[PDB]
């Protein structure tokens, strides 16, 4: 815990974003899940002609 | 009585060899132990040097890609777009169905 | 008799371990040596790819 | 003959529980080993990646963002349909 | 006789728990050994990974 | 006590992680307002 | 029962939100639930493009 934290306390929203990221990789790992997402969305936003 | 005496010398003996099996084991897997460690930090090592090879040559193409790009960027754009989706689309059982139309059921297997 | 017996596998175990630790320190060097190799063998196969990239690349920014 | 023959069980058992003890205690200091090892490990590959973001924050955040998106999003099963049409059944298994 | 005989095994099973025992201990400290060395191998490597990372 | 913050945070997305790895999702917008169980 | 009410005593909030988590990953370890969740989601926000 205490090394996790002072290397974390110096920057606390990056290790939210790369550790979220790496919790999401290992979630959705299996191929047993369905993601209901929109075309509108911000992600597909380079999917409309420019 | 005289068969649970020999018996009684046998365990002794037999507390002795069960160390020599622990003993090979230990002197056994940790040999092994070492060599599964040179392995994946041999692994390790291919890795920084992949990533980083991998990466020059993207950089090189971006690079090169990049003037034309800025020579006419709507003509590239059109292009590169089309090309793109023109791949998803035929790799996706797509639907095209009208605004108007609203619940629907994913069916998933 | 039976104390003879028994001192005779107690013999054989010494052996097999002494034996054991032998071949099994062939494999752990065995292993490194693969290991470098592999590494090696990455190496020249990724320094290939971005060598081809770049041809890649070129082609397209031509087109 | 029970007497002696449920004493020997009893003694028998005795020390079998210990080397079952002393085996799990082992076991949970090897986890204890690793745990810290891990730690360290990850705090160093964070460390240095550190540096190299302060200098191109949104750049970084785009490459990382989209590379874990493709990642998950070509495992999963995707839709891509109007958010408009709320209503939608799952039929699961 | 059947009296002695059944103390005389006692000592027999006394001697072989032992050994088992010590045995069990033996692999188990041993397993420890091993474990410990994977772990630091395999803390070098991600200090190398992040390396490649920081540098691309 | 030292920090809170960043402890709780790393607990969280750890013990998360590990549920949501271990459970089958879904991910539909929350406009959606219709679903069927269809359970045993 | 004592001896857990003294120590957690110390911090209430901290015992509660570890023995929480806890009981999510022995309650959900099974692979027969589902879990419904959006992208909405709090736990989701780093999925919208940065």
């Known amino acids: 815990a205490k090394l996790f934290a002072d290397a974390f306390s110096k920057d606390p929203d990056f290790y939210a974003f790369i550790r979220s990221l790496r919790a999401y990789e290992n979630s959705f790992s299996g191929n047993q899940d369905v993601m209901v997402m929109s075309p509108d969305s911000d992600f597909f936003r380079y999917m409309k002609t420019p | 009585v005289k068969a649970a005496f020999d018996d009684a010398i046998a365990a002794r003996e037999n507390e002795q060899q069960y160390i020599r099996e622990a003993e090979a084991y230990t002197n056994e897997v940790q040999p092994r132990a070492n060599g599964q460690a040179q392995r994946i930090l041999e692994e390790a090592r291919a890795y920084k040097a992949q990533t980083i090879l991998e990466a020059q040559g993207e950089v090189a193409r971006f690079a090169k890609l990049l003037p034309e790009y800025k ?9 590169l777009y089309i090309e793109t989706m023109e791949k998803v689309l035929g790799n996706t059982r797509k639907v095209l169905v009208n605004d108007k139309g609203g619940n629907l059921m994913v069916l998933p297997l | 008799t039976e104390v003879s017996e028994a001192i005779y596998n107690r013999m054989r175990a010494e052996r097999e ?9 062939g494999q752990e060097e065995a292993e490194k040596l693969r290991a470098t190799a592999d590494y090696e063998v990455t190496r020249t196969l990724a320094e290939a790819e971005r060598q081809g990239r770049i041809m890649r690349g070129e082609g397209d920014a031509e087109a």
Do not use: D, L, M
């Not at chain 2, 020579?71 to 292009?79: D, F, G, S, Y």
């Not at chain 3, 371990?17 to 320190?25: G, I, N």
């Open chain 3, 17 to 25: 371990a002494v034996a054991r630790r032998h071949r099994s320190q």
């Open chain 2, 71 to 79: 020579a006419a960027p709507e003509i590239t754009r059109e292009r």
